[model samples]
Target chain A: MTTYTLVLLRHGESTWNKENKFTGWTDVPLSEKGEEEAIAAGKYLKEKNFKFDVVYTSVLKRAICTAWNVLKTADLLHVPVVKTWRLNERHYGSLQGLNKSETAKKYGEEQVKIWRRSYDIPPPKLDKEDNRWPGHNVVYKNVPKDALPFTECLKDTVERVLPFWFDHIAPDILANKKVMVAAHGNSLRGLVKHLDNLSEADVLELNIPTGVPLVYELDENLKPIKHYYLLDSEELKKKMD
Target chain B: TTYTLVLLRHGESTWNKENKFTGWTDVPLSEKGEEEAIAAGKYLKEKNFKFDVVYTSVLKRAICTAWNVLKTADLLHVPVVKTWRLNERHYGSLQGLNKSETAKKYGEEQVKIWRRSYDIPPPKLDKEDNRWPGHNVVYKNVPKDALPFTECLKDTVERVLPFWFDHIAPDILANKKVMVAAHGNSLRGLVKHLDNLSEADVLELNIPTGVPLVYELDENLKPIKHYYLLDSEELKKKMD
Candidate 1:
């Protein structure tokens, strides 16, 4: 029986993640801790003898750099990587650059949680004239203006992420290629929701930790046989005790 | 009309600085090597040279060198293509041995022949040896015969030319400025091919690390002009 394997990884902590700011589409470098996390993830996968046929990542540096570090450690740097804006973080719109706590203080906590966690309720939209809007970025120049988001809810993220999943990612998996995707928290959460068949409400509580490898074993029909986080078995045993 | 291509050898690897045979061993760049790559990038920037795309070998030293150069050149966002085809010559039994020690043990004349001869290869490696080509994860999927036990310049050229003809030549023909960051022997093999050097004449060619050699080619891909970034008369005379 042919089995396909997929490894999903969220990028390590970014400068904004440490700052408690809404990162959205803002390009930020990985913090030193983030770099270590990415390297450790790669080393773990390497120790497990995990091999990837190709890699997928967002255009953002945090995602791209994480992928680079992983590939470098895994001795698979030669594998081709496809970068797309579809894998980008959910755009925070006007909330971008604002401290998350400050935003929560200004708006009520419940309202901020809805904006952050609700499936369809987007944050306040950024105006086209706003420099934070990605429409004017050179990286997004080729992206259709209507498709580029001023603000995105989880629902909006799923709309973009699923198409790339079906078009670019699924076919490779079906071809029996081991695929690795290095992306953002919400972007990966969107994929996880689809792969695990989670409901909208079920997805709200899901949080993916940074730089951990989540492996999925799928049958020929693409149904998941099993899925598990790849932690050191020794650490896992110790944790159980 | 002139089409441009830049050929760069990676900076000093750990093995390179240690005076060891590093063929396919995947040693990383030293700090000095990193600095050299940055300098190469700065030099390219000063010349106002820009590349549409970049190519590198599978090994860490070359890959990291390419990254450093592109980062310094302000072209980090440009797409990079890495291939095993650009890998350094496989050293076979001679791999992991100190160069000076090997020369002393095997006699200087024999070492020189293995190091410089166009078609003469070193001793073949046993497949069970620790340094076998298949030991590298990147080469795991490669066919057994394609994995070299030892490779001369001719063997390296045989492998590298197909990639150039298939992948790189088309991009250059289409007017894309191309940059290739690869290894010493691989670059030499390419230089020999592009200049159509004699097997005897090619023996004298030596490529310095972290130097960018720019070439202007005609429509037929013949070199119309060529110069090193550091302006070496010896290189110019050799090309002429």
Candidate 2:
């Protein structure tokens, strides 16, 4: 029986991340520091002799560019890259382009908290005609109506993301190839929830910081034997802060 | 047949810098060669030139040059067609041999004859020769008769013109701006066919590496005027 290692990576900082805006699903480019972080991540993979059979990334440029930079640095640029809409960041809906502080001020602390942290409460629905619609992106064609989320609470993301993991991604893992997933915060949390079999309420409390690699060791039956952050304790603590 | 046609000779390759005869041999661009391609893009952008479609040889240097140009011009999304028909004329037995050594080994006159004759192909390589065929993945799917070990300028023109007529002519007639990014000899073939150059006159034609040759066509698709993007003085020096 073969045990495959599933490595999950949140994308490096985007321009919105640097500006302290609510990024959600709005497409943005990786910042210079974000590019540097991706290079470092690839260097770490190379140093550790980590070779991936396939790579999966979100359709957004921040995740895609981070994956591209990392693959180029790791000398793995030739590997086939599959971009999926399912891996996109949690949709912030109407809060997408607004500053977090301004939104917090306007909506008050409790409303802002619910918008950010509530399990089932989506912020607000963005219009389909908005330029930010998935149809406007170059990668995704024939996007299903239900797949295009106007807004996605963390719970909604988990519900959407887990089905993809079980039906599509897990079968690859069951085949014994090491899989590298480059995605975003909440969507990755959705995957993390599935891998750990975390309860729905407990999943809402999980947070994986940007650019840190998470490793999951699976048993013979493809069950998670153990999971740990690739970062050291001090770095992990800093990320939790 | 009122088709707009633009020809771009690929930038200086590593073999070009090394002064080797590198027909159909895949070689990457040297660092300065990359700079020349970007410079070509900047020149095109300054002129507000844009293309509706692009075509390139399957060879990496030509493809990379086209990629850089389209990316710099913010036209990365344009449709690209790649084919082996646009590859440089095959060098045959002389593929890897240094030009001067080949001249010394075979007498200078014989070498000159092989190099200069428009219709004469150099010695053909055996099927067992690793350099011959089955080496390129793009040709793996091609029918047996389509592969080549050696090709003369006339042979190249014969093979390439059909692709142009079939793929390029229709798009141009439809009012689409067409860009063909290819190797020197292949472009020479197209140039000869387009300008109705006689064999003797066509032999004198030299497209300088990395220069864009623009041809403005009238409604009947005949060349109204033609010029290289470079100044006449610089262009003349490259002809030597």
Candidate 3:
């Protein structure tokens, strides 16, 4: 029986994650702990013998650094990497630099959930002139203006992420090349939802932690056999007794 | 011309600064190396150089330099392909041997000839030698017979050109802006092939570290002209 291996990992904690801020496309650095997390994840992948032919990641530093650390630690630095804006974090738009906890306190949990958790509702929009706009970034110059986002709902993110998944990534997986995607939590959710056929409501509660290597074993037709994190989370449980 | 190609040698590595031959050795960048890479990136950014794709060697010196360039130029979104074919010329048993020691042992004339000759390789390393490229994990993809124990510039050219013909040439012909981050010998072998440089010219050819070398080509991929990124004084002093 032939099976294809794919590993999906979210970048480790960004400085914003430590500061309790909404980072989105703000391009934050990995906290020192975050860098360690990525290296540890790489060691775990090495232990599991997860070799990758190529890595796909967002252009953002957090995701790029995570990919770099993983490849360096795994002794797979020779693996090619393809970076694109399509895998960027869900654009938090005007909320990008805001303190997440502070905003939650002001609006209460239910209202905040409506803003962030509703599948189709976006957070807020950025004016084109806003320095935070993707148009202002040189990396996005190759992309058409219409494709650039103001803010993205999960639905909007899914719309953007799947095209590249079909065009670039799916072909490689079909060719039986071992693949890894280093990206943001929300951007990966679109892929996870599509692969697992999750309902809109079921997707909201699905959260992946920072820098965890989640492996999927897929059959020849690309149907998922099983997906599990390499981490022994039960062993990570604190003293609850 | 729509076809533009850029060549870069990675800045000095820890081994480079330590006066050791670093062939296929994966050493991190020394301090000046990092700054030198940034300087190259700054110049590229100032020129508004853009790339669709980049290729680099497997070693961290080359990989980190490529990363620094892409990140510094705000071209982090560009896809990068890393290959062992573009690795530094394998210095064999001489690797990690300091330059002065090699000159003392081999004599300055023999050392100079080995450094500049087209076909004279340094002493070959045994497979058991930890300095052999065959022993490195990064070259695992390379077939056993194909992996290098030692390389002359000619042998380096032999391995390097196939990758160019197979991947890079096609990309440039299709109008993809391409950049290569590689070692001095690997880049020279490529430049020799492109310019059809005579053996005499090849002797004089030295690729400056951490500088952008641009080539404008006709649609057929014939080189129209090529020049380094340095200014008049610096460019002249490169040879001196």
- Interface RMSD, in order shown: 2.0, 6.0, 1.8
All candidates: TM-score of chain A? 0.94, 0.92, 0.93
Where does model 2 exceed 4 Å of error?
A1-17, A21-101, A104-241, B1-4, B230-240
> B11, model 1: CA deviation in Å?
1.2
B-chain TM-score, candidate 1: 0.92
Q: What are the lDDT figures for the candidates, one per model? A: 0.85, 0.78, 0.85
- Which docking band does candidate 2 fall into? incorrect
* lDDT, residue A236, model 2: 75
For every prediction, compared with the true complex, DockQ reads 0.37, 0.10, 0.57
Any residue pairs clashing in model 3, and if so which? Answer: none
Cα shift from native, residue A139, model 3 (Å):
2.1
Residue B60 error for model 1, in Å?
Answer: 1.7
Error of 2 at A219 (Å): 21
lDDT of 3 by residue, A88-146 (tens): 88888788888877888877777668778789988879999989888988677677877
Q: Score candidate 2 by lDDT.
A: 0.78
- Report the lDDT tens digits of candidate 3 across residue range B1-240: 668899988888888667988777777778888877888999999998999889988887888889889879877777888888898888866788899899888887877777878879988888788777766666666787889888788888899999999998999887688999988888988898899988778778778887899999987888999888978878777554
Question: Can you give the lDDT of residue A62 in candidate 2?
Answer: 82
Sort the candidates on lDDT, descending order: 1, 3, 2
Mark the 10 consecutive residues where model 1 chain B has the least summed lDDT: B231-240
Question: Of the candidates numbered 1 and 3, which has the greater TM-score value?
Answer: 1
